[PDB]
Amino acid sequence: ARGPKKHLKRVAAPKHWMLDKLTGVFAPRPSTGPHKLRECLPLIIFLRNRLKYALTGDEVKKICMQRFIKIDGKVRTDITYPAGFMDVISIDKTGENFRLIYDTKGRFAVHRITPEEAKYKLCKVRKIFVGTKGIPHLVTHDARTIRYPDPLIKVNDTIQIDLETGKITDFIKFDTGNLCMVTGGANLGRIGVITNRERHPGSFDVVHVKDANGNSFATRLSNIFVIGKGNKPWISLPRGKGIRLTIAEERDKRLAAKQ
Amino acid sequence: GISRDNWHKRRKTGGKRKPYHKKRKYELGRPAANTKIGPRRIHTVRVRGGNKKYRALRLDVGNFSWGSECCTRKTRIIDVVYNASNNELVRTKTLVKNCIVLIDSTPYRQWYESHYALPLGRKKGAKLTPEEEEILNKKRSKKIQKKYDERKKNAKISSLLEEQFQQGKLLACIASRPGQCGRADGYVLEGKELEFYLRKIKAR
Amino acid sequence: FPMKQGVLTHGRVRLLLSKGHSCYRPRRTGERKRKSVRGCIVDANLSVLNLVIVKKGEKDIPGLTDTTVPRRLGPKRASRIRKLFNLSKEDDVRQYVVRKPLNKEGKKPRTKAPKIQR
Amino acid sequence: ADIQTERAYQKQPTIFQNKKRVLLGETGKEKLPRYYKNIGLGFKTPKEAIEGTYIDKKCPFTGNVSIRGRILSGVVTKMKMQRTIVIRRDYLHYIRKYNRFEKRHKNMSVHLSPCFRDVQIGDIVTVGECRPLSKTVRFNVLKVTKAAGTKKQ
RNA sequence: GCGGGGCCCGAAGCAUUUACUUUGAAAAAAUUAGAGUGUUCAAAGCAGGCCCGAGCCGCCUGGAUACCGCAGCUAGGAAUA
RNA sequence: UACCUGGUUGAUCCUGCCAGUAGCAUAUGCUUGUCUCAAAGAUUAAGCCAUGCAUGUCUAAGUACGCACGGCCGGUACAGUGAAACUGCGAAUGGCUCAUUAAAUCAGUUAUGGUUCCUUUGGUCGCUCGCCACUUGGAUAACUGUGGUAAUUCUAGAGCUAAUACAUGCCGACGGGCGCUGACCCCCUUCGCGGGGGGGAUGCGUGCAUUUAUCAGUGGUGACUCUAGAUAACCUCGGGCCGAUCGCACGCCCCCCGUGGCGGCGACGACCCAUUCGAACGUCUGCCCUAUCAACUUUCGAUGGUAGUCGCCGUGCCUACCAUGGUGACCACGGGUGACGGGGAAUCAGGGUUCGAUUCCGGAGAGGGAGCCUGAGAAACGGCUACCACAUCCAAGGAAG
């Protein structure tokens, strides 16, 4: 109204947080940060709904104010910090080292990683430009910007950066044939190879994505996130491997494992 | 509380539209700066963002540009000679953006003499002893006499333009927005554009 | 109602006061308020007036121009203690600090010293 | 037949008119460099937007206006009002209660750039959109295509 | 697009224009429609389930899916008007 | 459940309504043993309101020269704990109500290539050639001590004292490079000559940001007057950045030399760039009843055109000078609404009918209109000024709503 809002109601929160309805009126309201907030996930509900190390909004605070929660190799001390996608959280005392990945039902999935794969993350670039005195810049998926990148990295290309150094390790170019992940829209969480990128002059470009089991689909270019060279992903995948099962296909594999 | 929004206009058909909220803060009051020639008074008004804009209450000099030989010097403002938007703003001598100004020639006379070594503004001579006889002669060397005698292609000025170097004052045009940035910059009239306005001053 | 410097009219008028004129300490920032203040010309319609000596002449009024109050809080920033004791240069500012004596009855008789600044 | 019919010197904001006039640059054969640009989405720039002599802030080819947004189409219905025409775009509106349509319309004022000659009453004109140019004129004319002409006695 | 040849097809013109139809995006939850689950039952709620032989650093699993008009944006169709 | 039943007549077949019947939602009537969820001053009065309350806030880390306390660990800067006050930051959220508002809001959609954005993150923060820097200047609160008022979070005078408050201002990097200039090159064609070069003596300017002009055409987009490069110059005194700040563990070189040089992790601020949270203005299509409302809008902006003025930016948003336009029976314009819009709700064969003040999203407004201050963000009302309306205290001088 008269300025920016800093509350959030519980039913207006994104449903892939999977919040309750009757435990309160309000929602966690993730702070301003690297990721946009409908897309993202805050640190509060991660350790009391998704990991159950805490029970209140007070208990998530007094683990975090003991200064060992390492988002992307940095200790972030506010409990409504927006986490986001392809980031490594690090407990560093009991050492789980999660990476935040969408599962095949559209939700952030609890997913461990080995403590030497935890050293890096991947980021789609959204803009490359020349900065002052004729030097290059790029800006990434998160708010990290990079000076002097490898000049083969075009727009909406995927880079790999390591934490604790911060310069780009590997770039992996958006080309047909590569193995992408969709992070937005009705198809998100599914993992498949890129078929083609069909252009639109001025409008939105859509791509078609063939999965590894014939079910091709399509989302527009702004949702596509390449994480593989040809067919092998550079990161560990969650269970299901980004294959959306139908509801009869979800029925029988779930009601036969409970044999 | 003078506003700038669109809901007080009669709409495209010709119907009265009724006000649907109060007038807001982001249609902030718009008083005129009315920058005029004198000493230097600059006042600063904050805007949204906490930013500043320098409105110019009274101005003395400018930073006008020459272009054809690419010279820019500060120069003081003598007179306002013609305005396109309103013939009443020149009887009150007020600086606006597209007004034709009148400035002096003593930054442009001495740069052109210190670069080409031709007398300039002269019609009669026999007074040129103190700093004019020396600058074109200067006891040059060989190759410095070489590089200036080859500028006898690009020392010419069109006859409509040195006609106003003789009798003192050059008329130029403001390109800056005084009262918005607080400066009076711009460029000098020349060419087919100068034939335009010197008709529109003579026809007054 | 207190007087105000610069009215140049005897009587009582009403001024719109911002932060930093006189006679008005605001409650929140940016607040302006209209308040009645008395003019700077003095009249017979004053209940009290303040009155400060700039020159002592003949003799001692008892209880008024004698009995010096000790200025108990000395200089604290390390440029008004260097100016007070006429210290030339690097004269060990920590040494010539003034110290307040403390004389409660039920406690041991203390001394306190300040911090330093700059 | 001149261009300077205003009370201010009409010119293009980018090109510089003066080019070292002298015994090299004689006043007999004198052109000036014409700034034009090209609009995307495959729309041609007509000859009169290059070899013309006009001046317009609001021409999409030689002014400071940049088309991006919708592209529509209409019929030129009134060709008064210097440098801005009014076009009417008919359409059909559907009432699902009666399962039948409703022949509606709404007209719209668009900027006729003077790089078009044969714009007469009753043509087809495709129109793109851009920044606000006047109180009601939000669009700009891209491509005329004639109708009811080509031969007249 | 495997200055002049071959298993070769992209840019380009859409060479009347539309309506119509089909496809694909993108569409906030709650609610409704429904999947799951002895809240003891039910209306509801989104939880819960499983053996302790103690190693049980506790294990497994859910928190679906369908519906978002018309208007736009894509591709395909050309009878009908 | 795609459903009917009683009534005009002496009877009859009809048309047609009436009545019946079933929901659900306000109220009311009699009645009411137990337990799970649970609306609740919306309609009429967006009427009036006593009283009490709902926005405030210390870290190891801005300022303790209150004995309020401390072991006052000892002959001196401060063992800390700290009230109060200065500074900073919130108080622009939430809550409430539905009065206004009929292409307006709002909804889908699509833009900002026409702008701003505290923060959050991530960047940038020795690029500038120029007799305190081992630290510069002046005040002020809390405090002390006098007060004035019937009466308020009213405040006065004088004495003290601080800063991350309010201002000033430098060292180092700094050795120079470049460009514009410029007293010797004679080795070239001195043959009378014209010469072809590199070079110094010389004085200016030099980074980012702001402002204007011109030149060229690294990286971009469907598309620039984009980004980056180049040259001439600007830099507003109510003056752009280029750290005179505070914690913690303390270590290293010590050759000048036992006093001077080097260092780890922070916490703060800092122009600009992107990000995030946004906001604003635009495009498309969509809204109820009325012709006992058929022409409207333009002196007084109605539609456009040039030039501007301010505005954060586009634009009649204003102003001047010209053009005579724009909308309309495909319902303009005027009127009404018991009109906040929507997600929705009741209904239930299909098509529909009707409700939606009400927890979700958005908008509007705090008695009525209006004007501003601070601030990144308010034309704010548990902010201020004024009128109107209503109303409180007075010791009748004023005070506060």
From Swiss-Prot, chain A:
Primary location: cytoplasm
S4 RNA-binding domain sequence ranges: 41-103
Keywords: Acetylation, Cytoplasm, Isopeptide bond, Nucleus, Ribonucleoprotein, Ribosomal protein, RNA-binding, rRNA-binding, Ubl conjugation
Subcellular location: Cytoplasm; Nucleus, Nucleolus
GO molecular function: RNA binding; rRNA binding; structural constituent of ribosome
Residues where N6-acetyllysine is found: 232
Domain of life: Eukaryota
PROSITE patterns, per database record: RIBOSOMAL_S4E (PS00528), S4 (PS50889)
Family matches, as HAMAP family: Ribosomal_eS4
UniProt record similarity statement: Belongs to the eukaryotic ribosomal protein eS4 family.
Annotated function: Component of the small ribosomal subunit. The ribosome is a large ribonucleoprotein complex responsible for the synthesis of proteins in the cell. Part of the small subunit (SSU) processome, first precursor of the small eukaryotic ribosomal subunit. During the assembly of the SSU processome in the nucleolus, many ribosome biogenesis factors, an RNA chaperone and ribosomal proteins associate with the nascent pre-rRNA and work in concert to generate RNA folding, modifications, rearrangements and cleavage as well as targeted degradation of pre-ribosomal RNA by the RNA exosome.
Quaternary structure note: Component of the small ribosomal subunit. Part of the small subunit (SSU) processome, composed of more than 70 proteins and the RNA chaperone small nucleolar RNA (snoRNA) U3. Identified in a IGF2BP1-dependent mRNP granule complex containing untranslated mRNAs.
Entry protein name: Small ribosomal subunit protein eS4, X isoform
Gene designation per UniProt: RPS4X
Swiss-Prot record, chain B:
Biased composition (Basic residues): 7-25
Keywords linked to the UniProt accession: Acetylation, Cytoplasm, Isopeptide bond, Lipoprotein, Membrane, Myristate, Nucleus, Phosphoprotein, Ribonucleoprotein, Ribosomal protein, Ubl conjugation
Modified positions (N6-acetyllysine) in chain numbering: 36, 127
GO BP annotation list: cytoplasmic translation; maturation of SSU-rRNA from tricistronic rRNA transcript (SSU-rRNA, 5.8S rRNA, LSU-rRNA); ribosomal small subunit biogenesis; translation
Membrane topology, record value: Lipid-anchor
Post-translational modification Phosphoserine, affected residues: 159
Region (Disordered): 1-26
Entry annotated with the keyword Ubl conjugation: yes
Cross-link (Glycyl lysine isopeptide (Lys-Gly) (interchain with G-Cter in SUMO2)): 169, 192
Modified residues (Phosphothreonine): 129
GO cellular component terms, semicolon-separated: cytoplasm; cytosol; cytosolic ribosome; cytosolic small ribosomal subunit; endoplasmic reticulum; extracellular exosome; focal adhesion; membrane
GO MF term set: RNA binding; structural constituent of ribosome
Entry's family note: Belongs to the eukaryotic ribosomal protein eS8 family.
Subunit-structure text: Component of the small ribosomal subunit. Identified in a IGF2BP1-dependent mRNP granule complex containing untranslated mRNAs. Part of the small subunit (SSU) processome, composed of more than 70 proteins and the RNA chaperone small nucleolar RNA (snoRNA) U3.
The protein's name: Small ribosomal subunit protein eS8
Organism: Homo sapiens
Source taxonomy: Eukaryota, Metazoa, Chordata, Craniata, Vertebrata
Curated annotation (Swiss-Prot), chain C:
(3R)-3-hydroxyarginine PTM positions: 77
Modified residues (Phosphoserine): 88
Residues in coiled coil: none
Post-translational modification: Ribosomal protein S6 is the major substrate of protein kinases in eukaryote ribosomes. The phosphorylation is stimulated by growth factors, tumor promoting agents, and mitogens. It is dephosphorylated at growth arrest.
Compartment(s) of residence: Cytoplasm; Nucleus, Nucleolus
Protein's job: Component of the 40S small ribosomal subunit. Plays an important role in controlling cell growth and proliferation through the selective translation of particular classes of mRNA. Part of the small subunit (SSU) processome, first precursor of the small eukaryotic ribosomal subunit.
UniProt family annotation: Belongs to the eukaryotic ribosomal protein eS6 family.
Assembly and binders: Component of the small ribosomal subunit. Part of the small subunit (SSU) processome, composed of more than 70 proteins and the RNA chaperone small nucleolar RNA (snoRNA) U3.
Protein name as catalogued: Small ribosomal subunit protein eS6
Classification lineage: Eukaryota, Metazoa, Chordata, Craniata, Vertebrata
UniProtKB/Swiss-Prot annotation, chain D:
Coiled coil stretches, renumbered: none
Role of this protein: Component of the small ribosomal subunit. The ribosome is a large ribonucleoprotein complex responsible for the synthesis of proteins in the cell. Part of the small subunit (SSU) processome, first precursor of the small eukaryotic ribosomal subunit. During the assembly of the SSU processome in the nucleolus, many ribosome biogenesis factors, an RNA chaperone and ribosomal proteins associate with the nascent pre-rRNA and work in concert to generate RNA folding, modifications, rearrangements and cleavage as well as targeted degradation of pre-ribosomal RNA by the RNA exosome.
Protein name per its UniProtKB record: Small ribosomal subunit protein uS17
CDD domains in the cross-refs: Ribosomal_uS17
In-chain residues carrying the UniProt-annotated modification Citrulline: 21
Residue list for modification N6-acetyllysine: 37, 44, 57
PTM comment text: Citrullinated by PADI4.
Modified residues (Omega-N-methylarginine): 68
PROSITE patterns: RIBOSOMAL_S17
One of the record's GO cellular component terms: cytosol
Protein location: Cytoplasm; Nucleus, Nucleolus
N-acetylalanine found at: 1
Keyword field contains Transcription: no
Gene3D superfamilies: 2.40.50.1000
UniProt cross-references to NCBIfam families, sorted A to Z: PRK08572.1 (NF006345), uS17_arch (TIGR03630)
Principal cellular location given in the protein's record: cytoplasm
Superkingdom of source: Eukaryota
Subunit-level organization: Component of the small ribosomal subunit. Part of the small subunit (SSU) processome, composed of more than 70 proteins and the RNA chaperone small nucleolar RNA (snoRNA) U3.
Lineage: Eukaryota, Metazoa, Chordata, Craniata, Vertebrata
GO biological process, one term: translation
Natural source organism: Homo sapiens
Lipidation (S-palmitoyl cysteine): 59
A single MF term (Gene Ontology): rRNA binding
Keyword Hydrolase set for record: no
